[PDB]
């Protein structure tokens, strides 16, 4: 099961992984990391973070061009919800808090894995 918005479904099994291991888990499940593209999608992800009591990865990262956060397509963000002062070792990946706000993090951080389908 999971939380859905339109045709998109977010799911978690409570796994906690680094960014690379999280990406591999979602891809092997034939999805991808949570990529909220709207307020409504962000709120669905946030509900799951609050339930699990653990910040989650989003898919987006700036590994290609520093400060330009992109999806796995390489396209620039169409929506963001940065915490105050964010984006503030390098922090190339993105976590979502239980208040729904985002923070850039080192990609070695171990976070909740939420996939989208
Ligand atoms: C690993 C991690 O999440 N670090 C966070 C965290 O860093 P500090 O070590 O607590 O200053 O809070 C910062 C905001 O004050 C945030 O920008 C940063 O990404
Ligand atoms: Ca960065
Ligand atoms: Ca940060």
Curated annotation (Swiss-Prot):
Residues in C-type lectin domain copies: 24-117
Superkingdom: Eukaryota
Disulfide bonds: 26-115, 93-107
Record PTM: The hydroxylysines may be O-glycosylated.
Residues bearing attached sugar chains per UniProt: 88
Ranges in a coiled coil: none
Function per UniProt: Calcium-dependent lectin-like protein which binds to a yeast cell wall extract and immune complexes through the complement component (C3bi). It is capable of binding non-reducing terminal N-acetylglucosamine, mannose, and fucose residues.
Assembly, per entry: Oligomeric complex of 4 set of homotrimers.
UniProt family annotation: Belongs to the SFTPD family.
Record's protein name: Conglutinin
From-to range in the entire protein, with total length: 250 to 371 of 371
């Amino acid at each position: 099961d999971g939380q859905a918005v339109g045709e998109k479904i977010f799911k978690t099994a409570g796994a906690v992984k680094s960014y690379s291991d999280a990406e591999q888990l979602c891809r092997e499940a034939k999805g991808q990391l949570a990529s909220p593209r709207s307020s409504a999608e962000n709120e669905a992800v946030t509900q799951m973070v609050r339930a699990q009591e653990k910040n989650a990865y989003l898919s987006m990262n700036d590994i290609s061009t520093e400060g330009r956060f992109t999806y796995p397509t390489g396209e620039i963000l169409v929506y963001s919800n940065w915490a105050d002062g964010e984006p503030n070792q390098p922090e190339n990946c993105v976590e979502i808090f239980p208040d729904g706000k985002w923070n850039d993090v080192p990609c070695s951080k171990q976070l909740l894995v939420i996939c989208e389908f």
